[PDB]
Amino acid sequence: SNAMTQAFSRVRFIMTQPSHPGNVGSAARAIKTMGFGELVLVAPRFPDMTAQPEAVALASGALDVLERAAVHDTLEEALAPVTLAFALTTRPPPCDIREAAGLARRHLDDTEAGVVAIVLGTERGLTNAQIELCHRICHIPANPQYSSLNVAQALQLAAWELRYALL
Amino acid sequence: SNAMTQAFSRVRFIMTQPSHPGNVGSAARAIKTMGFGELVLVAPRFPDMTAQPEAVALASGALDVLERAAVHDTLEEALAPVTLAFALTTRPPPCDIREAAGLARRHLDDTEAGVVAIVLGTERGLTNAQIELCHRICHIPANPQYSSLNVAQALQLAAWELRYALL
């Protein structure tokens, strides 16, 4: 359990350019429900995003994850300690979130202090340059007519895959 | 694609005793994003639940799934055409949603007109008698300290597993 909590502490979820504070709260709750505590914001629209009343209100239960969330201005900063980073998208097929989760497990098992990150843009995606900063691209193959799903939903799916692959 | 849409038409999601109309709308949007169109309500708190303004508002995009949703007073009625029904819970470990999804795929492939259902209660669960009506129990092994997650979130996970297993 403690050993298991430590494995989970080695996964990070990075939201770039979060625009909506409620999404940031939902984000925190989403990952906590999957056992993750590490949320990172890059270049949010507002300073003190994670202190905004709607982020707090949508975080209920995961207020701790929300407080501890790190904010950087750049993805470079957010990636500095990361050894394996997935760019998450919805656009030849890149590896899917299920493959990506399996790779994450292998990486965390094969390195002493490897760190895995999942990197998300928002509906309004990740720049080509942000994507180039990651080790891999992965995607969530959702309905074509309805592939555009809330970033917090993307996050829950990713965190569910990761949880399953780590248990 | 048409053949594939038909496979997806053979999966149903059943919510018992839905209490909150917004959850019913979120439910519809959740399954549509995964490619499913079949939502069933058993014994909702209110008649015309799916017509309630908050269900509509939280359904945006999936208003069609929401309109077509069938409402019955009993789970028996909702199960009559179902050949393989999973009781979804969060409580020896029953089969998990990932095993359950694989079984669903096999069933839909092995029968001409098999029908699969996922059956959900709400936070306030499924009665023992409702559970006894299903073929199997399955569970979503989420964080212990945070296993209680919105029914629409439970639904999205289930529908994601099912989608993946059917693609």
PDB file of all heavy atoms in Angstrom, chain A residues 13 21 39 49 59 73 75 79 81 90 122 161 163:
ATOM      1  N   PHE A  13      -0.083  14.710 -13.917  1.00  0.00           N
ATOM      2  CA  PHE A  13      -1.007  15.168 -14.969  1.00  0.00           C
ATOM      3  C   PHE A  13      -0.880  16.661 -15.187  1.00  0.00           C
ATOM      4  O   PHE A  13      -1.112  17.467 -14.290  1.00  0.00           O
ATOM      5  CB  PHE A  13      -2.462  14.810 -14.629  1.00  0.00           C
ATOM      6  CG  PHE A  13      -2.674  13.336 -14.383  1.00  0.00           C
ATOM      7  CD1 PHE A  13      -2.284  12.763 -13.192  1.00  0.00           C
ATOM      8  CD2 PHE A  13      -3.204  12.526 -15.365  1.00  0.00           C
ATOM      9  CE1 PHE A  13      -2.459  11.422 -12.966  1.00  0.00           C
ATOM     10  CE2 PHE A  13      -3.375  11.163 -15.155  1.00  0.00           C
ATOM     11  CZ  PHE A  13      -2.995  10.621 -13.942  1.00  0.00           C
ATOM     12  N   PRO A  21     -11.678  27.606 -14.599  1.00  0.00           N
ATOM     13  CA  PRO A  21     -11.324  27.190 -13.229  1.00  0.00           C
ATOM     14  C   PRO A  21     -12.087  25.969 -12.707  1.00  0.00           C
ATOM     15  O   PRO A  21     -11.520  25.165 -11.969  1.00  0.00           O
ATOM     16  CB  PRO A  21     -11.651  28.421 -12.385  1.00  0.00           C
ATOM     17  CG  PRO A  21     -11.512  29.556 -13.312  1.00  0.00           C
ATOM     18  CD  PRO A  21     -11.997  29.032 -14.663  1.00  0.00           C
ATOM     19  N   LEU A  39      -1.124  17.168  -9.675  1.00  0.00           N
ATOM     20  CA  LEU A  39      -1.670  17.963 -10.762  1.00  0.00           C
ATOM     21  C   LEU A  39      -0.815  19.210 -11.009  1.00  0.00           C
ATOM     22  O   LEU A  39      -0.481  19.927 -10.092  1.00  0.00           O
ATOM     23  CB  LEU A  39      -3.094  18.390 -10.433  1.00  0.00           C
ATOM     24  CG  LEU A  39      -3.784  19.328 -11.440  1.00  0.00           C
ATOM     25  CD1 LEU A  39      -4.189  18.621 -12.713  1.00  0.00           C
ATOM     26  CD2 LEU A  39      -5.009  19.905 -10.780  1.00  0.00           C
ATOM     27  N   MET A  49      -5.435  30.525 -10.257  1.00  0.00           N
ATOM     28  CA  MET A  49      -6.447  29.630 -10.801  1.00  0.00           C
ATOM     29  C   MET A  49      -6.956  28.621  -9.796  1.00  0.00           C
ATOM     30  O   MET A  49      -8.154  28.402  -9.699  1.00  0.00           O
ATOM     31  CB  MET A  49      -5.831  28.816 -11.930  1.00  0.00           C
ATOM     32  CG  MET A  49      -5.789  29.523 -13.233  1.00  0.00           C
ATOM     33  SD  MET A  49      -7.443  29.150 -14.150  1.00  0.00           S
ATOM     34  CE  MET A  49      -7.414  30.566 -15.493  1.00  0.00           C
ATOM     35  N   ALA A  59     -13.970  20.816  -6.750  1.00  0.00           N
ATOM     36  CA  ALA A  59     -12.940  19.901  -6.275  1.00  0.00           C
ATOM     37  C   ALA A  59     -13.348  19.107  -5.042  1.00  0.00           C
ATOM     38  O   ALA A  59     -12.638  18.194  -4.656  1.00  0.00           O
ATOM     39  CB  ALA A  59     -11.651  20.653  -5.996  1.00  0.00           C
ATOM     40  N   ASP A  73       4.885  28.622 -15.873  1.00  0.00           N
ATOM     41  CA  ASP A  73       4.565  29.358 -17.076  1.00  0.00           C
ATOM     42  C   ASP A  73       4.889  28.568 -18.328  1.00  0.00           C
ATOM     43  O   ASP A  73       4.368  28.855 -19.412  1.00  0.00           O
ATOM     44  CB  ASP A  73       5.341  30.674 -17.118  1.00  0.00           C
ATOM     45  CG  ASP A  73       4.887  31.679 -16.047  1.00  0.00           C
ATOM     46  OD1 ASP A  73       3.772  31.528 -15.498  1.00  0.00           O
ATOM     47  OD2 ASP A  73       5.655  32.626 -15.756  1.00  0.00           O
ATOM     48  N   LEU A  75       6.009  24.627 -20.356  1.00  0.00           N
ATOM     49  CA  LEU A  75       5.886  23.182 -20.319  1.00  0.00           C
ATOM     50  C   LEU A  75       7.286  22.611 -20.024  1.00  0.00           C
ATOM     51  O   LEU A  75       7.470  21.612 -19.305  1.00  0.00           O
ATOM     52  CB  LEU A  75       5.272  22.658 -21.633  1.00  0.00           C
ATOM     53  CG  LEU A  75       4.994  21.131 -21.729  1.00  0.00           C
ATOM     54  CD1 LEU A  75       4.071  20.568 -20.633  1.00  0.00           C
ATOM     55  CD2 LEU A  75       4.454  20.725 -23.087  1.00  0.00           C
ATOM     56  N   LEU A  79       8.042  19.674 -17.469  1.00  0.00           N
ATOM     57  CA  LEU A  79       8.735  18.459 -17.900  1.00  0.00           C
ATOM     58  C   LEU A  79      10.128  18.218 -17.319  1.00  0.00           C
ATOM     59  O   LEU A  79      10.652  17.094 -17.398  1.00  0.00           O
ATOM     60  CB  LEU A  79       8.794  18.391 -19.424  1.00  0.00           C
ATOM     61  CG  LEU A  79       7.367  18.325 -19.967  1.00  0.00           C
ATOM     62  CD1 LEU A  79       7.298  18.128 -21.452  1.00  0.00           C
ATOM     63  CD2 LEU A  79       6.631  17.212 -19.246  1.00  0.00           C
ATOM     64  N   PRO A  81      11.389  17.412 -14.475  1.00  0.00           N
ATOM     65  CA  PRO A  81      11.712  16.148 -13.800  1.00  0.00           C
ATOM     66  C   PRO A  81      11.079  14.908 -14.464  1.00  0.00           C
ATOM     67  O   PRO A  81      11.159  13.806 -13.950  1.00  0.00           O
ATOM     68  CB  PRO A  81      11.155  16.335 -12.382  1.00  0.00           C
ATOM     69  CG  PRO A  81      10.317  17.618 -12.413  1.00  0.00           C
ATOM     70  CD  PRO A  81      10.251  18.093 -13.845  1.00  0.00           C
ATOM     71  N   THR A  90      -6.771  14.367 -29.199  1.00  0.00           N
ATOM     72  CA  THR A  90      -7.905  13.817 -29.948  1.00  0.00           C
ATOM     73  C   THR A  90      -7.982  14.491 -31.322  1.00  0.00           C
ATOM     74  O   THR A  90      -8.635  15.519 -31.488  1.00  0.00           O
ATOM     75  CB  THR A  90      -9.247  13.903 -29.172  1.00  0.00           C
ATOM     76  OG1 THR A  90      -9.219  15.024 -28.278  1.00  0.00           O
ATOM     77  CG2 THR A  90      -9.478  12.629 -28.362  1.00  0.00           C
ATOM     78  N   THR A 122      -6.335  22.078 -24.035  1.00  0.00           N
ATOM     79  CA  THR A 122      -7.777  22.230 -23.865  1.00  0.00           C
ATOM     80  C   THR A 122      -8.414  22.398 -25.240  1.00  0.00           C
ATOM     81  O   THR A 122      -7.703  22.635 -26.222  1.00  0.00           O
ATOM     82  CB  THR A 122      -8.137  23.403 -22.947  1.00  0.00           C
ATOM     83  OG1 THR A 122      -7.635  24.616 -23.515  1.00  0.00           O
ATOM     84  CG2 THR A 122      -7.530  23.200 -21.556  1.00  0.00           C
ATOM     85  N   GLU A 161      -7.049   4.336 -16.969  1.00  0.00           N
ATOM     86  CA  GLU A 161      -6.068   3.451 -17.645  1.00  0.00           C
ATOM     87  C   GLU A 161      -4.766   3.266 -16.880  1.00  0.00           C
ATOM     88  O   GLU A 161      -4.249   2.148 -16.715  1.00  0.00           O
ATOM     89  CB  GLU A 161      -5.762   4.026 -19.020  1.00  0.00           C
ATOM     90  CG  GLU A 161      -6.986   3.778 -20.009  1.00  0.00           C
ATOM     91  CD  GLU A 161      -7.216   2.298 -20.364  1.00  0.00           C
ATOM     92  OE1 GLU A 161      -6.313   1.466 -20.160  1.00  0.00           O
ATOM     93  OE2 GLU A 161      -8.309   1.949 -20.855  1.00  0.00           O
ATOM     94  N   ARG A 163      -4.312   3.911 -13.627  1.00  0.00           N
ATOM     95  CA  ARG A 163      -4.562   3.171 -12.409  1.00  0.00           C
ATOM     96  C   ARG A 163      -4.605   1.662 -12.674  1.00  0.00           C
ATOM     97  O   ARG A 163      -3.978   0.850 -11.988  1.00  0.00           O
ATOM     98  CB  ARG A 163      -5.886   3.648 -11.792  1.00  0.00           C
ATOM     99  CG  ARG A 163      -6.377   2.782 -10.668  1.00  0.00           C
ATOM    100  CD  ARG A 163      -7.606   3.454  -9.929  1.00  0.00           C
ATOM    101  NE  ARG A 163      -7.880   2.650  -8.753  1.00  0.00           N
ATOM    102  CZ  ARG A 163      -7.180   2.702  -7.630  1.00  0.00           C
ATOM    103  NH1 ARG A 163      -6.198   3.572  -7.496  1.00  0.00           N
ATOM    104  NH2 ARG A 163      -7.463   1.881  -6.639  1.00  0.00           N
TER     105      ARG A 163
END
